[PDB]
């Protein structure tokens, strides 16, 4: 179907620079929007950079301004991102992301394997508790608690929820509060109000284990919850 | 003598302008509606309208304000603006008819190349580049001192006369060669074609000799009077008042015929092209239809009422 | 009754539009050779489908929204998957079983696809096999348009017959014979009751029918209406009949009385297509002027 | 008004950029309409140029050509003839030696097709180019079978002059268009030279139609 | 073309089982359909600007 393989995630000298790129094949990257998402080695996904399909709009994060750069290549059909001045915070397991954008599109649907890089205001969203012991077959609930309401003036919120399996590539479960993703069972279903949001996990079994995440798209800042382990 | 000739001249300037103005306004409106369909000549007639009548229609306003006998109540800034408008209008009108004829030549012989280059974006880029080139050419006119008079400054100093000769060479003689070259190339590229008949050839030849000869016999003797007063003033810097009086009379009457040609450029355009006959006929029909001068239905109702 | 938004955004000769199931998206077909899925609110296109054959005269958006069908006079019917995993639009399978020109293709279902073609017949096609499960025949002339029921079980088609014939999709049987047209049927629409339908044609009259009655209920004719009808559509509540004409303008008649209810005089060029949203919220007009405009 | 809206704007602009480039690429191609009947020499014209309709694409000098062979449509012509309204030229091919064949001679009924296609309101100003076929055997055979009203010699040159003129004389409302009759020997080297000069004669008129002067 | 009329005319005799309703009751189906969907018809009952999304 689609292939996203990062190139050369290794050791970087502190404060240096190193070329990192996700090799791509098998999709219309020319018509697709791209993202990069970091993962600190213990806890926490958050967004890094976004390059548009037409390479016209470039948006970075608070620690991504200037010192990180982005670029692409359409005939070879891959994506580059250059990072300079790397430190302990800058070290993360970065994920190459593709994300198509229109009405009903499912952005952040696929990922790579990761960039293993080790050296040597903002909307606040937090999931309520980061560790829930469960049983394979009983229903549980987890809630990402934002700080401001997510409901746009047009009446439709934008809010995406994610499942990371234990030590492998994550998935997207439900996008914009009402729509389930492909390849995802109907037992997972999000819920909540326009300001408060909560998941309705029903009849879980032994592959739903791992950390769970929120994400929004009403404001460009994401800074979603740090995660929630769902332990057996 | 000089005062009565000038006042009767500005009176007939006002008369010529009153006979001229609705033609310029209607050609502006026709160009604006023709811009809706993508055409290089449409936007070129639009910017010809944008450089037409701005000084021409406002000239009788100052004429009926006062018959100017070199009286200067203003702070000279507005008159320098009017001099810039008129000189730049002459330069853009001449070089713009040159480049529309260049487009006609490149489209009648290099028909494969032209339709790629006949994008209206290329048209607006060329119009902007010609406008900024005319601005650079007109910059030393603003930088000239001895700004007592706006019409011409060849009387006192000969260095600014050399500046005027430089502007003459860069903006009159070269576009004359350009228009002659490209119009005669239109001539040969059409007389080497068989898909046109004699009526096509005759109509294009007559319209093209018409625009060339009106441009010649109006603007070219103005160039002649400019060069002859430059030469005479360079000789006799030191009957000087009488000779400059007669040169002033020649200059103002040559300005009258040049303004007649400038206001006649859309008139000659509409009396040359048959699409103008079709569009002016439907414009007349729409004017009557939305002005309600027929009133035939209300006449039917009226003869229904009285009986 | 006035234009709220105008979409435009094409190149040349827009032939057909079909409203999406979301009541926001619409598909625009053009003789250029490019198929565009539009969005009404943001006025920005969401998909561009290149065409192997430039000659198209009909388009189809599935009521599921997953698939889009486009055909042409090539005798080859193409159904495209919008939501591919790769993200491109790819034709699922070529469909060449007719001998004429594919005048109209619609979506009964994802698997069952109805196409009216110019081989004097209509056939029910499956994407999985590419063969005709049922073939509907009996029209003298070449079929140009069809109108599905909301149940998608009993549909009618019109040809160069001055007549319309219903069809039963399961057993491949003509259901009703509707006659009363004077000229060739340009377009036909179905009353979303599923019990009636009305049709207009080049004879400058729109005619109201009922499927079970098989009789003309009443005729919509006017003296100034000499130009022919090339598009018809209804309201979700009746009391209305959207109808595009050969006078370069649409018109609106009441479904019961047909007075001069709504005058729709926007397009400069001949209105090629006209459709009503599935919730009935808006009127969509399309024409060969490369213009798309929607009123309310 | 967020990342989703900004990204949607970029995709909706990138699509329009690719659309504009494809339209400018497509506009250079010359559209030609062939209306070849049975035994019109479709094989001959496609060789000399070298279920639905066939689209041939050929390049002459620096100008491409896309001719759309509408063959075996077996349908009413009026429902799809307006699809080719923007086509610059209409190519006609007629055999000349089949005047001894009545299925109502084929020559007479082929004139009616030309008569209908000339007087149509869609093609008010479209240049009409007609080509001929099997003229050599027409000389070999020939008059009384098809056109006894000529009432003259069986000389081929005068007979060909009679047939081509009366075929051209069928024009009644094409006074905007121009009938470009060419006597196709069916063995001549490049009869696209007739087409190239005729299509550039259209193009010379086409520019002079847009210069204002005609 | 004598055999061309066969499949044309066999189409007519398989159509003889025409189902029947009353044309006044057929027009009753028209009017009774109106008030069922009249609450969301934005042409005769146009939606106000809060419920109108076309602004
Ligand atoms: C324009 C070139 C022809 C020379 C003009 C001669 C006309 C005589 C006018 C005398 C009045 C002088 C008023 C000052 C403004 C002006 O135009 N001076 C020209 C001059 O001093 O000759």
Coordinates of C-alpha atoms in Angstrom, one line a residue, chain C:
Chain C
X1 CA -34.2 33.2 -4.9
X2 CA -30.9 35.0 -5.3
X3 CA -27.3 33.7 -5.6
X4 CA -25.7 33.1 -2.3
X5 CA -22.4 31.7 -3.6
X6 CA -20.7 31.0 -7.0
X7 CA -18.1 28.3 -7.4
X8 CA -17.0 28.5 -11.1
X9 CA -13.4 27.0 -11.3
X10 CA -13.4 25.0 -14.5
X11 CA -12.1 25.4 -18.0
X12 CA -14.7 24.6 -20.8
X13 CA -18.0 22.9 -21.4
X14 CA -19.4 21.7 -18.1
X15 CA -22.0 19.1 -19.0
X16 CA -23.4 17.5 -15.8
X17 CA -23.4 17.8 -12.0
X18 CA -24.5 15.4 -9.4
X19 CA -25.0 16.3 -5.7
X20 CA -23.1 14.4 -3.1
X21 CA -24.7 12.5 -0.2
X22 CA -23.4 15.0 2.3
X23 CA -25.4 17.9 0.7
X24 CA -22.1 19.8 0.5
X25 CA -20.0 18.1 -2.1
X26 CA -20.8 17.9 -5.8
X27 CA -19.1 16.4 -8.9
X28 CA -18.7 18.5 -12.0
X29 CA -18.1 16.8 -15.4
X30 CA -16.6 18.7 -18.4
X31 CA -15.7 18.0 -22.0
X32 CA -12.1 19.2 -21.2
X33 CA -11.2 15.7 -19.8
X34 CA -11.0 16.6 -16.1
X35 CA -13.5 15.5 -13.5
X36 CA -13.8 17.7 -10.4
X37 CA -15.4 17.0 -7.0
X38 CA -16.5 20.4 -5.6
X39 CA -17.5 21.7 -2.2
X40 CA -20.3 24.2 -1.9
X41 CA -19.5 26.0 1.3
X42 CA -15.8 26.7 1.1
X43 CA -16.0 27.0 -2.7
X44 CA -12.8 24.9 -3.1
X45 CA -12.4 21.7 -5.1
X46 CA -11.4 18.5 -3.2
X47 CA -10.5 16.2 -6.1
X48 CA -9.3 16.3 -9.7
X49 CA -9.9 13.2 -11.9
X50 CA -8.0 13.1 -15.3
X51 CA -9.8 11.2 -18.0
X52 CA -8.4 8.8 -20.6
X53 CA -11.2 9.8 -23.0
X54 CA -11.9 13.5 -23.1
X55 CA -15.4 12.9 -24.4
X56 CA -17.7 12.7 -21.4
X57 CA -21.4 13.5 -21.3
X58 CA -22.5 12.1 -17.9
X59 CA -21.2 11.7 -14.4
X60 CA -22.2 9.8 -11.2
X61 CA -21.5 10.2 -7.5
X62 CA -22.4 7.2 -5.4
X63 CA -24.9 7.7 -2.6
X64 CA -22.3 6.0 -0.4
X65 CA -19.8 8.6 -1.5
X66 CA -17.0 6.1 -1.9
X67 CA -17.1 5.8 -5.8
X68 CA -17.5 8.2 -8.7
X69 CA -18.5 6.9 -12.2
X70 CA -17.7 8.7 -15.5
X71 CA -18.3 7.4 -19.0
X72 CA -18.5 8.7 -22.5
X73 CA -19.2 7.8 -26.1
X74 CA -16.2 5.5 -26.0
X75 CA -18.6 2.7 -24.9
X76 CA -16.3 2.2 -21.9
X77 CA -17.7 3.0 -18.4
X78 CA -15.2 4.0 -15.7
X79 CA -15.9 3.9 -12.0
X80 CA -13.3 5.6 -9.8
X81 CA -12.5 5.0 -6.1
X82 CA -12.0 8.4 -4.4
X83 CA -10.8 7.1 -1.0
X84 CA -8.0 4.9 -2.2
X85 CA -5.2 3.9 0.2
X86 CA -2.7 5.5 -2.1
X87 CA -4.9 8.6 -2.3
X88 CA -5.0 8.8 -6.1
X89 CA -8.2 8.3 -8.1
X90 CA -8.0 5.0 -10.0
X91 CA -10.6 3.5 -12.3
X92 CA -11.8 0.3 -10.8
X93 CA -12.6 -1.5 -14.0
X94 CA -13.4 -0.7 -17.6
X95 CA -17.0 -1.5 -18.6
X96 CA -17.5 -2.1 -22.3
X97 CA -20.7 -4.0 -23.0
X98 CA -22.7 -1.5 -25.1
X99 CA -22.6 -0.6 -28.8
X100 CA -23.6 3.0 -28.7
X101 CA -22.7 5.9 -26.4
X102 CA -23.0 5.9 -22.6
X103 CA -25.4 8.7 -22.2
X104 CA -26.1 8.4 -18.5
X105 CA -24.6 6.3 -15.7
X106 CA -26.0 6.3 -12.1
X107 CA -25.4 4.4 -8.9
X108 CA -28.1 2.1 -7.7
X109 CA -25.6 0.7 -5.2
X110 CA -21.8 0.2 -4.9
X111 CA -22.0 -3.2 -6.6
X112 CA -25.0 -2.7 -8.9
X113 CA -24.5 0.2 -11.4
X114 CA -27.2 1.3 -13.8
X115 CA -26.1 2.8 -17.1
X116 CA -28.3 4.2 -19.9
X117 CA -26.4 4.0 -23.1
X118 CA -27.1 4.8 -26.8
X119 CA -27.5 1.2 -28.0
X120 CA -31.3 1.6 -27.5
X121 CA -31.0 -0.3 -24.2
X122 CA -29.9 0.0 -20.5
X123 CA -28.1 -2.7 -18.6
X124 CA -27.3 -3.4 -14.9
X125 CA -23.6 -3.7 -14.4
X126 CA -21.5 -5.2 -11.6
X127 CA -17.9 -3.9 -11.0
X128 CA -16.9 -7.4 -9.8
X129 CA -17.7 -9.2 -13.1
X130 CA -18.2 -6.5 -15.7
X131 CA -21.2 -8.3 -17.1
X132 CA -24.9 -7.4 -17.4
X133 CA -27.0 -9.0 -14.7
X134 CA -30.2 -7.5 -16.2
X135 CA -30.5 -5.6 -19.6
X136 CA -33.5 -3.3 -20.1
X137 CA -34.6 -3.2 -23.7
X138 CA -37.7 -1.8 -25.5
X139 CA -36.8 1.8 -26.3
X140 CA -36.9 2.6 -30.1
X141 CA -34.5 5.5 -29.8
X142 CA -31.3 6.1 -28.0
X143 CA -31.6 6.6 -24.2
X144 CA -30.2 9.8 -22.9
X145 CA -31.2 10.1 -19.2
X146 CA -32.6 8.1 -16.4
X147 CA -34.0 8.9 -12.9
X148 CA -33.6 6.4 -10.0
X149 CA -36.1 6.1 -7.2
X150 CA -35.1 6.8 -3.7
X151 CA -35.6 3.1 -3.0
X152 CA -33.4 2.5 -6.1
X153 CA -35.7 -0.4 -7.1
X154 CA -38.0 1.0 -9.8
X155 CA -36.5 3.4 -12.3
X156 CA -37.5 5.0 -15.6
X157 CA -35.5 6.0 -18.7
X158 CA -36.2 8.1 -21.8
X159 CA -35.0 7.8 -25.3
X160 CA -35.6 9.2 -28.8
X161 CA -39.1 7.7 -28.5
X162 CA -41.1 10.7 -27.3
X163 CA -41.8 8.2 -24.5
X164 CA -40.5 7.0 -21.1
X165 CA -40.3 3.4 -20.0
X166 CA -40.0 2.2 -16.4
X167 CA -37.8 -0.7 -15.5
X168 CA -37.7 -3.3 -12.7
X169 CA -34.1 -3.8 -11.7
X170 CA -34.3 -7.3 -10.3
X171 CA -35.8 -9.4 -13.1
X172 CA -34.9 -7.0 -16.0
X173 CA -38.4 -6.2 -16.9
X174 CA -40.0 -3.0 -18.3
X175 CA -42.6 -1.9 -15.7
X176 CA -44.5 1.0 -17.3
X177 CA -44.9 2.7 -20.7
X178 CA -45.2 6.4 -20.4
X179 CA -46.1 8.2 -23.6
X180 CA -47.1 11.8 -24.2
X181 CA -43.9 13.6 -25.1
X182 CA -43.9 15.4 -28.4
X183 CA -40.1 15.6 -28.9
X184 CA -37.0 13.9 -27.7
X185 CA -36.6 13.6 -23.9
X186 CA -33.5 15.6 -22.9
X187 CA -33.6 15.0 -19.2
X188 CA -35.9 13.2 -16.7
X189 CA -36.2 13.4 -12.9
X190 CA -37.9 11.3 -10.3
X191 CA -40.2 12.6 -7.6
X192 CA -38.6 11.6 -4.3
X193 CA -41.9 10.1 -3.1
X194 CA -41.1 7.2 -5.4
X195 CA -44.8 7.3 -6.6
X196 CA -44.6 9.9 -9.4
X197 CA -42.2 11.7 -11.7
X198 CA -42.3 14.6 -14.2
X199 CA -40.4 15.2 -17.4
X200 CA -39.5 18.0 -19.8
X201 CA -38.2 17.9 -23.3
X202 CA -37.5 20.0 -26.4
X203 CA -41.3 20.5 -27.1
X204 CA -41.2 23.4 -24.6
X205 CA -43.6 21.7 -22.1
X206 CA -42.9 20.1 -18.8
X207 CA -45.4 17.2 -18.1
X208 CA -46.4 15.8 -14.8
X209 CA -46.9 12.0 -14.4
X210 CA -47.5 9.3 -11.8
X211 CA -46.0 5.8 -12.2
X212 CA -49.0 3.9 -11.0
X213 CA -51.4 6.2 -12.9
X214 CA -49.5 5.9 -16.2
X215 CA -51.4 9.0 -17.3
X216 CA -50.5 12.7 -17.7
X217 CA -51.7 14.5 -14.7
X218 CA -51.2 18.1 -16.0
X219 CA -49.0 20.0 -18.4
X220 CA -46.8 23.0 -17.8
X221 CA -46.9 25.1 -21.0
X222 CA -46.5 28.8 -21.6
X223 CA -46.6 30.9 -24.8
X224 CA -43.2 32.6 -24.1
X225 CA -41.8 29.1 -23.5
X226 CA -40.8 28.1 -27.0
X227 CA -37.3 27.0 -26.0
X228 CA -36.8 23.4 -24.9
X229 CA -36.2 21.9 -21.5
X230 CA -32.8 20.1 -20.9
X231 CA -32.9 19.7 -17.1
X232 CA -35.6 19.0 -14.5
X233 CA -35.5 18.6 -10.7
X234 CA -37.9 18.8 -7.8
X235 CA -38.1 20.0 -4.2
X236 CA -37.9 17.8 -1.2
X237 CA -41.5 19.0 -0.3
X238 CA -43.1 19.4 -3.8
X239 CA -44.8 22.7 -4.5
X240 CA -41.9 23.4 -6.9
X241 CA -40.3 22.2 -10.1
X242 CA -36.7 23.4 -11.0
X243 CA -36.4 23.4 -14.8
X244 CA -33.5 24.6 -17.0
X245 CA -34.4 25.8 -20.5
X246 CA -33.0 26.6 -23.9
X247 CA -33.5 30.3 -23.2
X248 CA -30.0 30.3 -21.3
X249 CA -31.9 30.5 -18.0
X250 CA -33.6 28.1 -15.6
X251 CA -37.2 28.4 -14.5
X252 CA -39.3 27.3 -11.6
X253 CA -42.9 26.0 -11.8
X254 CA -45.2 24.8 -9.0
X255 CA -45.7 21.1 -9.1
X256 CA -49.4 21.5 -8.7
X257 CA -50.3 24.8 -10.5
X258 CA -47.1 25.9 -12.3
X259 CA -47.3 29.7 -12.1
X260 CA -44.3 32.1 -12.5
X261 CA -43.0 31.3 -9.0
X262 CA -39.3 31.6 -9.4
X263 CA -37.4 33.4 -12.2
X264 CA -33.9 32.1 -12.5
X265 CA -32.0 34.2 -15.1
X266 CA -28.3 34.0 -14.1
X267 CA -26.3 32.0 -16.6
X268 CA -25.1 33.6 -19.8
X269 CA -24.7 30.2 -21.6
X270 CA -27.1 27.3 -22.0
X271 CA -27.9 25.6 -18.7
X272 CA -26.6 22.1 -19.2
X273 CA -27.4 20.6 -15.8
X274 CA -29.5 21.4 -12.8
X275 CA -29.8 19.5 -9.5
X276 CA -31.3 19.8 -6.1
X277 CA -29.5 18.8 -2.9
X278 CA -30.7 15.6 -1.1
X279 CA -32.0 17.7 1.8
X280 CA -33.4 20.2 -0.7
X281 CA -31.4 23.1 0.8
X282 CA -30.1 24.6 -2.5
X283 CA -30.4 24.8 -6.2
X284 CA -27.4 24.1 -8.4
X285 CA -27.0 25.3 -12.0
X286 CA -24.3 24.3 -14.5
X287 CA -23.5 25.3 -18.0
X288 CA -20.8 25.2 -20.7
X289 CA -19.6 28.7 -19.6
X290 CA -17.1 27.1 -17.2
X291 CA -19.4 28.5 -14.4
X292 CA -20.9 26.8 -11.4
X293 CA -23.3 28.9 -9.3
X294 CA -25.8 28.0 -6.5
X295 CA -28.7 30.0 -5.2
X296 CA -31.1 29.9 -2.3

